[PDB]
Symmetry: D2
């Protein structure tokens, strides 16, 4: 009996409510998240683009850019990884299927696909365009049919709220779930009551994207639990703090000609080694 | 056709010592460029510990490094110096393939060290190094492989802690004699030593000012007085980024919200300016 | 620094028409070089069917192609023309990244076409070609992305078979005006037709002389009389290699030994001479 | 969840000896499957010479091999045995990462050999091998790294040409004792030698029936009589494919047309059938 990351994700959902899922920009951070106690992690599409590629989150990253990060993370971290698969990386069902099979093989526990048109953008940006309900239903059907591991999770994300309104978005959500979506990700929700409306309407686990500096308030896990949201996602939180800290080191070093004044803000060598189990490896070499 | 190696050599001429900062990923390379740096570095310890979440013990492969080189140089135009450990392989063919692949991936130069196969950080105890002759062969193979004459082949020696200063300097002389264009005397403990290496080899000397190791935190003024050509800060940004990430993860887990650490975060606008986001979005909307 | 694109342009002035053969992998690129060819080709159909064992229906990713470009150009010095389909993405950003990535990978040039998604690949006759304006946008994005001025941006049009000769010529003129440096008109069946395109655009014209299709197997003499600048044989060696491989598999399975097909095999020495084996091994023996 | 290694082991019990053919790329893996084979092989000499156009001298990287494993196993369901040379690195950490990475890539098993660093074909002269103790360490590292219990760890020994039959058999016994699940005695020159290895280790034995080397072209009946469980043909199709391609290139260059060699080519309809083309288009 082989281990299923998808089965581990589903199990995590039953043990934590809402299940906190944090984005992990790279393998090192996945280990840090695990050491912090999280039971599930996330590979942000915006993070692969802005972090790994230094590019805008506008459909520029490819399937392989993402697979590279999935392998890096899952090769060392045992926590189930939910992956942002944007629109499936292609214009047809064959592309969606290749995406699902490849991510399962790379080690992911699940993925979400959204209803945006080709060159997608952040759900917290204006002027987004979405495909017809029927088109997304076909994306979803193709994804579910491609599952090689029955416990792998296929989540549907809808960006329809800001575009067509709440009722239209709920209607799409119901159609997406009827089409096979196993969990729902209603993006950029502005009021807590909306999560409850979605939850009651589709009756499958609901994910709340609590990302910073967007259209969504910073809801607490208590508030989210009261609206019956199954998981709380913090997609780029650590990434944002890491960038400010790195920027600070770069500026100080440039202005002062030494990093002495920011040593206090750095993870120590020992803390790094502890994080990656360094001593156990070096001891083996020494012997 | 633009040569990154040529740009690196040029940077050396305009700044002395030339500050070179490690960039863990493409995003940070852009932040380093915006901070004014003229050259950047791809740390082997960072590819291992950061990109792979593994110890810096010769576990990373040439391709793990090539992936990060392309990601960084595809978006950042600053010359990138790359840590190539011992050449990724048992023979001169592996060293040559490493050199040609890194040049093609967009690097400006690389350094190869004299450690045995499963190398370790120059600041760790119990290092093992190959014979002077064996290292000379690795350097000869690397130099002969250059497809871009301006690409830089830098030699690193870890012999100070293993054989002493005089032995380390003798190796450095042999390495440069064999074709190494720049020298990286690892884990120096006293400022005066940099001057001795500089005088002995007559090629640019790089001082590795990494934290929590055997080397004091020398300032650029101090390094300049010792005739150091380059001041390297390999993982400085990475160490701060890790502490900050850990803080966010801990607070979110304990508090059930990130409200209390919002002030420690780069804002969305700052991120967008960093990656030239608005230029791309404007094109799409038009 | 050597420019593959500059080498391709040079080969065009020394041979007319310039024979360009598809090379399915690095080994065959070396065989082509030994046979005397001055330029080679990375077929999109070959990357799909050969490297991935899949149909040429928009399933391959940019990275699948880049891997083959690096393998071939890392060892073979001949200029490599690459099939870049529609740019591997839905926007001008994807086209630009494809161009820059292929240049870095070592290619001498590429051709981009005017189909919608993989609709023409799927043989759909209606609404399968983008508007002239949309293709001009792809071309301008490709040309502006050139990091090496000598890299070649060729335009391929799949319109003759669906819109007629007049429309295909009109598209071709608009494409060349937008920046296309050479033209690849597909589905031509008459020599006179090649001549018409040549006079209409006044840039080098490529004739696709693939087997088992509508196009007759024109000779280089015939093509020269029609003002064709280059003759492409995209999968020729690949087709013969597959029949030979299948034969070995069949004989081995029927007989329990490969004794009877040894005479159809490249000998070990022939392989060694092709990859310069002995010069490498001797260096190892003399350490 | 399906385990490729479990499938490989099952294939052994259903075919005696099990014919394993080298598949240079995903397309040929499908050709092998369509031809009736039950197991396939990813040759290290093929990744080097074919995918990279380079000598089989330890120049290929783990990544070059992983790419080919994913391409083949993403489309072909047959269990794939992979040539892992010496583990791709200088330490047991590298051997362990190779094992884990190949399992994730989709392989059914792999073989690791006892050569020193920059290895060479087992049919080449002057090869060098590590101590029995060092090989034992590589095998222990490999077996302990298995994330799929049914993944197969095969040990290959190049000792016959260097130290003789008895020393090669002694090493083979130490390797199996260390955990090797199957054995690959390379470049055997006499049929009877296979029976000796078979009797000495009690695990499945693989015979490498490659062309133009030190091993006679033994038939599957001969191999079965010597208690050989697997018959490997690592580059057979590749060699024929190369001659065929060379012929096309030469004829086309000399004649200015490929008309005279059309009869040596797989047709487009045959190509489409081998990759299930029309099955795709319709959807
Ligand atoms: Mg996203
Ligand atoms: Mg290092
Ligand atoms: Mg081999």
């Amino acid at each position: 009996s082989l281990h299923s990351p998808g089965k581990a994700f589903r199990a995590a959902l039953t043990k934590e409510n809402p299940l906190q899922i944090v984005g992990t920009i790279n393998a090192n951070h996945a280990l840090l998240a695990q050491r912090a106690g999280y039971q599930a992690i996330y590979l942000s599409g915006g993070g692969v683009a802005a972090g790994s590629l230094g590019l805008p989150d506008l459909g520029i990253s490819t399937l392989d850019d993402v697979l590279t990060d999935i392998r890096r993370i899952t090769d060392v971290c045992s926590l189930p990884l939910l992956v942002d698969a944007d629109i499936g990386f292609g214009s047809s069902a064959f592309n969606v299927a290749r995406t699902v099979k490849s991510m399962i093989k790379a080690g992911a526990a699940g993925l979400h696909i959204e209803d945006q048109v080709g060159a997608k953008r952040s759900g917290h940006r204006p002027n987004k365009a979405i495909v017809s309900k029927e088109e997304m239903v076909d994306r979803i059907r193709a994804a579910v049919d491609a599952k090689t591991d029955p416990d792998f999770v296929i989540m549907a994300r809808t960006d329809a709220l800001a575009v067509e309104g709440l009722d239209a978005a709920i209607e799409r959500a119901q159609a997406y779930v009827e089409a096979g979506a196993e969990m729902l990700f209603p993006e950029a929700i502005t009021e807590l009551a909306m999560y409850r409306q979605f939850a009651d309407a589709v009756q499958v686990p609901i994910l709340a994207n609590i990302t910073e500096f967007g259209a969504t308030p910073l809801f607490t896990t208590d508030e989210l639990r009261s609206a019956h949201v199954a998981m709380a996602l913090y997609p780029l939180s650590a990434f944002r703090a890491m960038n400010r800290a790195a920027e600070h080191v770069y500026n100080v070093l440039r202005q002062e000609g030494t990093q002495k004044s920011v040593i206090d803000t750095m993870q120590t060598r020992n803390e790094l080694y502890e994080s990656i189990n360094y001593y156990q490896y070096e001891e083996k070499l020494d012997n």
